[PDB]
């Protein structure tokens, strides 16, 4: 036992020494001759009313027009963001929903929460209504995030300190990603959908392999739990949002933290992060009802999208980078650019 | 300036708005209660009192009030990560086993219940949500205090080991665990696994909370 513990200690020290040996210069020392982005002004173009309780998640469609938003009145609403029309209003079997996801083909949505199941709704049916296609059960804690790979595979992350990869057609997990020590609060899929990262309630994000089921790398550095995580569009860097009022930009190939986005004025946790289309901007929703827009290469902004009256609990940019939609606990989705 | 299809899409959107408003008005006249308390505290008795994994939802009705109880003790996770989903409930039913004042977890089960009550009653989300504290196993507590002393749980206790004043002492401890006394109330009740007055007590406490909420709403309180 003691030999294994001392071996783990020596191996952690070896990992730290290897991570220090490759830190020749920080990202501030190299992105210093970049002209800043200036002042970013965004106005609420749209305001989507119709939820009657706290909105807990949203997700854009891949056509950059259709939304889906989950609130705890038991409703999944699918908005047409250009005209604010409600395309569908799906009544959930359990109103305690904590996440939603819009399939990349547009045929399905998924949602889950304190009921531990990830229901999958079929949008394009012949009888013209939206019915539950699958109810993926097998988690023993609340389901915190879920993302579609295609119309048949969805990866979820629960408070079981584990993530899982499901097969929608059969309804059972084909892969269970274990290795965390706290509640996994969010995940984010790679653009090529071969890898994904997950941020848990132990201040560590882990990079998983989808086809293998192993944890490639582990990224520590946060002082508190990680409530949100997104990929750089390049596919080989990611940002994490924590409860210590700090975004951090980790890199997959350098295997360490590159930059920390913090401000002495900010003392509230971070609920949602998302990069812009080119990756230059790092939007982050906070608990102080705002949404700061950071410079991903300079880390020198607080460009506030102050339009909400409660905690901004979710946000995401469209696939064409044309808009930013933020949902908050005040039951209103706003759309910014 | 809309086309023939866009007008019909807006009409579908307005029907969806109408159904959402109807569902909201239907779900606003329903009491939302939250069951808490440690394991083996007797909340199974309370969810059996109605007689009409994950979260468990119990819908029962009474004299013109529809209640919904949310038993959340089934899932084990960081309670501070999902406890804010219940920040708009009407009351909080909190079950405590009186017969667990001497049992140990190997610490003291009554002290664990007191710690959980201290953590939930003074949470930043339930800063004004009142608590309906049930104290189950009153007859088991009767026999236990007839055999075993209360000093094992509270060494600072100095009263005579009889049922009434020791039960009052336990209730006083739980109510002294309440840092916020200006905003919330604690409606204690000594239930047993026998009688059906529990739903009556829940109805009375919820009616008092509705009265206080309306008084705060229209200025008076």
């Amino acid at each position, epitope marked *: 036992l003691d030999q294994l513990r001392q071996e783990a200690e020596q191996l952690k020290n070896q990992i730290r020494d290897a991570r220090k040996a490759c830190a020749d210069a920080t990202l501030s020392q190299i992105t210093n001759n970049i002209d800043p982005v200036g002042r970013i002004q965004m106005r609420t173009r749209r305001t989507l009313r119709g939820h009657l309780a706290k909105i807990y998640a949203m997700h854009w469609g891949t056509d950059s*027009r*259709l939304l889906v938003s989950a609130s705890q009145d038991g409703k999944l609403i699918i908005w047409d963001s250009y005209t604010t029309n409600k*395309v*569908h209003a799906i009544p959930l079997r359990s109103s305690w929903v904590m996440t939603c996801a819009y399939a990349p083909s547009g045929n399905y949505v998924a949602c889950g929460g304190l009921d531990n199941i990830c229901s999958i709704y079929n949008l394009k049916t012949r009888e*013209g209504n939206v019915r539950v296609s699958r109810e993926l059960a097998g988690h023993t804690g609340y389901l915190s995030c879920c993302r579609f790979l295609d119309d048949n595979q969805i990866v979820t992350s629960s408070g079981d300190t584990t993530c899982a990869l499901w097969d929608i057609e059969t309804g059972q997990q084909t892969t269970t990603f274990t290795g965390h020590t706290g509640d996994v609060m969010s995940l984010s899929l790679a653009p090529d959908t071969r890898l994904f990262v997950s941020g848990a309630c132990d201040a560590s994000a882990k990079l998983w392999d989808v086809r293998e089921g192993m944890c490639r790398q582990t990224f520590t550095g946060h002082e508190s739990d990680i409530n949100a995580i997104c990929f750089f569009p390049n596919g080989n860097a990611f940002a994490t949002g924590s409860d210590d009022a700090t975004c951090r930009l980790f890199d997959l190939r350098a295997d360490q933290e590159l930059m920390t986005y913090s401000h002495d004025n900010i003392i509230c946790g971070i609920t949602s992060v998302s990069f812009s289309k080119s990756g230059r901007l790092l939007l982050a929703g906070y608990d102080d009802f705002n949404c700061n827009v950071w410079d991903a290469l300079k880390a020198d902004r607080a460009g506030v999208l102050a339009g909400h009256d409660n905690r901004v609990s979710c946000l995401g940019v469209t696939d064409d980078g044309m808009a930013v939609a933020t949902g908050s606990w005040d039951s209103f989705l706003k759309i910014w650019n | 300036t809309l*086309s023939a299809e866009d007008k019909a899409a807006v*009409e*579908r959107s307005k*029907m969806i708005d109408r159904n959402l408003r109807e569902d909201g008005e239907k779900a606003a006249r329903e009491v939302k209660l939250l069951l808490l308390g440690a394991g083996e505290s007797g909340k199974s008795t309370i969810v059996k009192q109605m007689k009409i994994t994950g979260i468990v939802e119990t819908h029962f009705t009474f004299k013109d009030l529809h209640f919904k109880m949310f038993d959340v003790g089934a899932q084990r996770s960081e309670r501070k990560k999902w406890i804010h989903c219940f920040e708009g409930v009407t009351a909080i039913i909190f079950c405590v086993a009186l017969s667990d004042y001497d049992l140990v977890l190997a610490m003291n089960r009554m002290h664990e219940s007191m710690k959980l009550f201290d953590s939930i009653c003074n949470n930043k989300w339930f800063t004004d949500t009142s608590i309906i504290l049930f104290l189950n196993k009153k007859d088991l507590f009767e026999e236990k205090i007839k055999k075993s002393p209360l000093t094992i749980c509270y060494p600072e206790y100095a009263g005579s080991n009889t049922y009434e004043e020791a039960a009052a002492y336990i209730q006083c401890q739980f109510e002294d665990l309440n840092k916020r006394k200006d905003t919330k109330e604690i409606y204690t009740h000594f239930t047993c696994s026998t009688d059906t007055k529990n739903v009556q007590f829940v109805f009375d406490a919820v009616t008092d909370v509705i009265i206080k909420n309306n008084l705060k709403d229209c200025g008076l309180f």
Partner: single-chain antibody
Amino acid sequence: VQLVESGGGLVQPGGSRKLSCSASGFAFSSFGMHWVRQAPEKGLEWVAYISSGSGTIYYADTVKGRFTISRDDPKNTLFLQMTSLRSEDTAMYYCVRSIYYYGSSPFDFWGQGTTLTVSSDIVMTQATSSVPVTPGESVSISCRSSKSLLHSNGNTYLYWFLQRPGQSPQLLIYRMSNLASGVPDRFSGSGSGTAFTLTISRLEAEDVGVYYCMQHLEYPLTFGAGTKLEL
């Protein structure tokens, strides 16, 4: 999915009749419903439309006042109360399902029809009412409109229907390029405002019939003269 109409037969000129279509197999209260009719040897012609929730009703100008469309949502039935019939008013009356949201495919399902015998707009033009077919080609027909169907949304509300001999019309292409669910990838639509084309590839049977081009930019929805292709 089933739409079965009833109430046909023979009526003397003048008077009244009530057509009823019983819907089964879909969420009837969510679909707007249309009535379209087809004269014995002519093309299609729109008659009436009631919305979902009955909050919007339109009629054709040759029908307004004499007919009354109504729906019974708990009974899953659609009614056409027609009064003061004429000799021209004889047709086969189809009941047409149609749902309207972003990306929907209205006019997708059609009833079977009931024969009824009696003892300013947008003009859609078909090229020729008959196209010869020899084995081993890829037919391509056209339908020229009299008004720009390209709305300022980018949508071009022109639909393409197929009516097999002795069958009900079937939706092929909605909004000039989107082929309906269940049709092969042979059928392709193209064109611009006021100029449209349906392209079929890899000749085979089961595509024999009259092809109708409908517009949907504004009411009344005017069909085309139809284009037969046979061999």
